[PDB]
Write a protein that binds this DNA or RNA. Structure first.
Lengths: 384, 64, 134, 103, 63
RNA sequence: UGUGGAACGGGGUAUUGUAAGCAGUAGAGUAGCCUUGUUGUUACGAUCUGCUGAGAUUAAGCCUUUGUUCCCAAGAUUUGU
RNA sequence: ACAACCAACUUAGAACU
RNA sequence: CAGAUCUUGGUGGAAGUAGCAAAUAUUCAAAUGAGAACUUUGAAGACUGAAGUGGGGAAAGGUUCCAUGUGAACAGCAGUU
């Protein structure tokens, strides 16, 4: 007897490798026609993690009006370029794409997504389409009007500017982002006006907003039941190993049940994490990116020595409390929350007081090179 | 060639182990024709086969 | 236990069968942790306690009239480090506790050594009878 | 200009990082051969015995972090249309130096 | 929002760095890292080690 | 053939803790010679002090680079509304 | 009763570091 | 003869699968050769560390000893040995 709960949840099954790496939005927010035309998703790249010290504004709490330290995750979010529009009909068999309209000129970044050997290829991806856009200017309008009258659901095609990131990959990430304004005609017009235009992170999300982060977790390879499902280690006396499950099944049913913990893949899985609060939407064009109202040092959002295995963030970034799935430099999907946030914790404004910029490459103790120089005085490499 | 017999004869002639027998790598053809104790002695006299010195076992640290 | 409110979750460093010093003047020295109040149901998990908890303890060394019986006690110090909401990990030089009653009133009169702020805020009697608080 | 000689510095530490102690010196030889193969484009690489002595100087599991090597692509006594690389060791005080074309 | 000073290494300690040790004599020690904490536990003097600010101040390093 | 890659080098960031060498009578003392000594000449001496926040390592799953030297514009297989 | 060296291993203690 | 866990012989699926992981460890160059990770030579790095992986014997074996050739079979990989 001695009843105990299950080891693991039978909702994240199968425990297999994800069929994707970008991470896809499985459900866009419900469309409200009264709201202005806006996007429901964005793509960024995880740069790393750092500290945050802030004053709590939670009445009735022991830490009210007190200092609290929280871990935050930095996601570099350079502006995304809109290059296409997709219309979705509402057939009794689900949403069905009717047609796709693309921009006149597609950059090399987005065009590399369509190829597996870009340099060896002739790079003739959007050639006849570009010719049609240049010399017809009639079929594009016809397709846009078709999306206007049909296609109750409208999504734009946007690709990341991965060339502005310190990543070796030149292949940009392309994703369908839903537009959740109103007046499907206005949605199409907004997409047409934003063709070959860059949409910024601050125009999609705002301060203290609760969002969802979508991405593929870190790969871990095969793993035994002890670490894959959290099963109890067998005693030291156990013959033929102990990092297993003792009883895999009973007699009739004379089969191994799907609910029994087994060894196998334990990482690289698609996950959506709910209720991530935006602590700061920083711009890459100001030298006070990591400064606060209570700490006026002219420093940007990058630890000295650079982010570990990422580099230096030189574009717009979003700071999220807690952790997000996936390793560093992985592309992450930020999605607007599908729920309503009325709790005081969700609605509490966040005012950062200090941002850690010490090196994450060790036990760093200096926030700026100027502070390091002030503490260390002059060194042997500095005197001569 | 195969100088196993020559090395054994050289060790016997030099009254040392086979580990202390040195044979000239540039005179393999000449050494291979020895096949006799008298020829091994001729090789030793000509300097083609020598007895390597013992490895160092100094006792300076022990004496100090 | 309806003393002053709620306490934040902290690392548990004193499981059952742990021997800790007695910080009061009741005459005990070897508080032997027997059980911890507020422990839920979980297979194979030893009930453990941190500073400010209400462990049940017996006296192994001290006045004979305090031995061979179970009395409530409050942990005031622990060697295991725990972090606060401000991101500061702190720990003490020893594990210590004070004999109390179910209502929380201390059986002793004075407390030797420093006391944890969480325990002092949780139990007003311990805060009154303590000196240096962290 | 196929016949050429260049002095390189090879960072042996990053190539021998996670290697087992009993295989460090043999793998250092193998990585040196691959190092010469990649830089000189010749599939045939000959390691000088003195260079092998230098690699094995401090045992099988203690290889120097950086080695100053001399790579010479040259002709062979075989067919006159085959290029091979000969790798030697260079005696320097500090091996932290850039690659130089030697003449 | 205050930056403290390590008890052993004497370096600036920002929030969330090192640990805090409360001794039996009501004395509070702040260690900036495990190296300083372990060395204090090993009973090393901060005036002996050359990398501590206390040593530099006592040996007029810097003038 | 390119806002290209690689191998080194430089800088930053981190780990450890002050490298070798030289000098100092600082050093518990010890042993020989003579002008016989409030810095003695001569020699040894665990250690200590100054060059020295030094030296070493620093991607191998750190960041950056305008520095130096090379390399690539190849080859094989399959694919038709 | 003195005594010029050669050739020996122990035991105990002190200072310094 | 279809049986007798039948007799003798041959041959299958398992299957190019289990496996060929104790005894610290090999590397470079040359010679030979059609063929070299295993042969020989030289150099380096190592081990047995004198109750040895050294030098001899008793019992037992019987030519395994030595030289010159060979690489059909054996040396559970290879072979110029």
């Amino acid at each position: 007897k001695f009843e105990q709960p299950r080891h693991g949840s039978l909702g994240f099954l199968p425990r297999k490798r994800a069929s994707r790496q970008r991470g896809k939005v499985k459900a866009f927010p419900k469309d409200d026609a009264s709201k202005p035309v806006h996007l429901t998703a964005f793509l960024g790249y995880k740069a790393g993690m750092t500290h945050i010290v802030r004053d709590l504004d939670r009445p009735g709490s022991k830490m009210h009006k007190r200092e609290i330290l929280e871990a935050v995750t930095v996601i570099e979010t350079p502006p995304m370029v809109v290059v296409g529009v997709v219309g979705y009909v509402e057939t009794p068999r689900g949403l069905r794409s009717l047609t796709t309209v693309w921009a006149e000129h597609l950059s090399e970044e987005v065009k590399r997504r369509f190829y597996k050997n870009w340099f060896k290829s002739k790079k003739k991806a959007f050639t006849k389409y570009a010719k049609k856009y240049a010399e017809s200017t009639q079929s594009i309008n016809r397709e846009l009007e078709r999306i206007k009258k049909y296609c109750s659901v409208v999504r734009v095609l946007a690709h990341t500017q991965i060339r502005k990131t310190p990543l070796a990959q030149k292949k940009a990430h392309l994703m369908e982002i839903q537009v959740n304004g109103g007046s499907v005609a206005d949605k199409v017009e907004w997409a047409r006006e934003h063709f070959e235009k860059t949409v910024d992170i601050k125009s999609t999300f705002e301060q203290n907003e609760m969002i969802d982060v979508i991405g593929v977790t870190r790969g871990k390879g095969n793993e035994g039941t002890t670490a894959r499902w959290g099963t109890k280690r067998l005693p030291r006396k156990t013959h033929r190993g102990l990092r297993k499950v003792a009883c895999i099944g009973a007699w009739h049913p004379a089969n191994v049940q799907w609910t029994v913990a087994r060894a196998g893949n334990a990482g690289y899985m698609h996950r959506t994490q709910l209720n991530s609060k935006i602590y700061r939407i920083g711009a890459g064009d100001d030298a006070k990116n990591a400064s606060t109202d209570f700490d006026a040092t002219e420093k940007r959002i990058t630890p000295m020595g650079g982010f570990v295995r990422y580099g230096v963030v030189e574009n717009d970034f979003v700071m999220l409390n807690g952790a997000t799935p996936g390793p560093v430099k992985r592309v992450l999907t930020l999605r607007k929350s599908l729920l309503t946030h009325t709790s005081r914790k969700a609605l509490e404004p966040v005012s950062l007081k200090w941002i850690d910029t010490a090196s994450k490459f060790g036990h760093g103790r200096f926030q700026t090179p100027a502070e390091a120089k002030q503490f260390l005085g002059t060194l042997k490499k500095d005197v001569a | 060639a195969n100088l196993r017999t020559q090395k054994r004869l050289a060790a016997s002639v030099l009254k040392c182990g086979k580990r202390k027998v040195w044979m000239d790598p540039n005179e393999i053809s000449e050494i291979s024709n020895a096949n006799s104790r008298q020829n091994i002695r001729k090789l030793v006299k000509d300097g083609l086969v020598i007895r390597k010195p013992n490895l160092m076992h100094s006792r300076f640290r022990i004496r100090k | 236990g309806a003393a002053s409110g709620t306490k934040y979750r902290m690392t548990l460093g004193l499981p059952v069968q742990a021997i800790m010093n007695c910080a009061d003047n009741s005459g005990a020295k070897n508080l032997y942790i027997v059980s911890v109040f507020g422990t839920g149901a979980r297979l194979n998990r030893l009930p453990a306690a941190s500073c400010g908890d209400m462990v049940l303890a017996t006296v192994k060394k001290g006045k004979p009239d305090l031995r061979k019986k179970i009395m409530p006690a409050i942990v005031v110090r622990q060697r295991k480090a725990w972090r606060r909401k401000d991101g500061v990990y702190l720990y003490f030089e020893d594990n210590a506790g004070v004999i109390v009653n179910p209502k929380g009133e201390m059986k002793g009169s004075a407390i030797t050594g420093p006391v944890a702020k969480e325990c002092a805020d949780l139990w007003p009697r311990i805060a009154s009878n303590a000196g240096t608080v962290v | 200009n196929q016949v050429v000689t260049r002095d390189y510095t090879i960072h042996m530490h990053k190539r021998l990082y996670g290697v087992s102690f009993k295989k460090r010196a043999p793998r250092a030889i193998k990585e040196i051969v691959a190092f010469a193969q990649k830089h000189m484009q010749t599939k045939e690489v000959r390691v000088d015995p003195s260079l092998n002595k230098e690699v094995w100087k401090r045992g099988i599991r203690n290889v120097p972090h950086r080695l100053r090597l001399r790579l010479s692509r040259k002709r062979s006594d075989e067919d006159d249309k085959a290029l091979y690389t000969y790798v030697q060791a260079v005696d320097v005080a500090n091996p932290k130096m850039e690659t130089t074309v030697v003449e | 929002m205050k930056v403290e000073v390590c008890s052993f290494s004497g370096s600036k300690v920002y929030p969330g760095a090192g640990r805090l040790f409360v001794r039996g004599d009501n004395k509070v020690f702040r260690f900036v890292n495990k190296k300083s904490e372990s060395l204090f536990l090993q009973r090393k003097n901060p005036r002996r080690l050359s990398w501590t600010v206390l040593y530099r101040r006592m040996h007029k390093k810097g003038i």
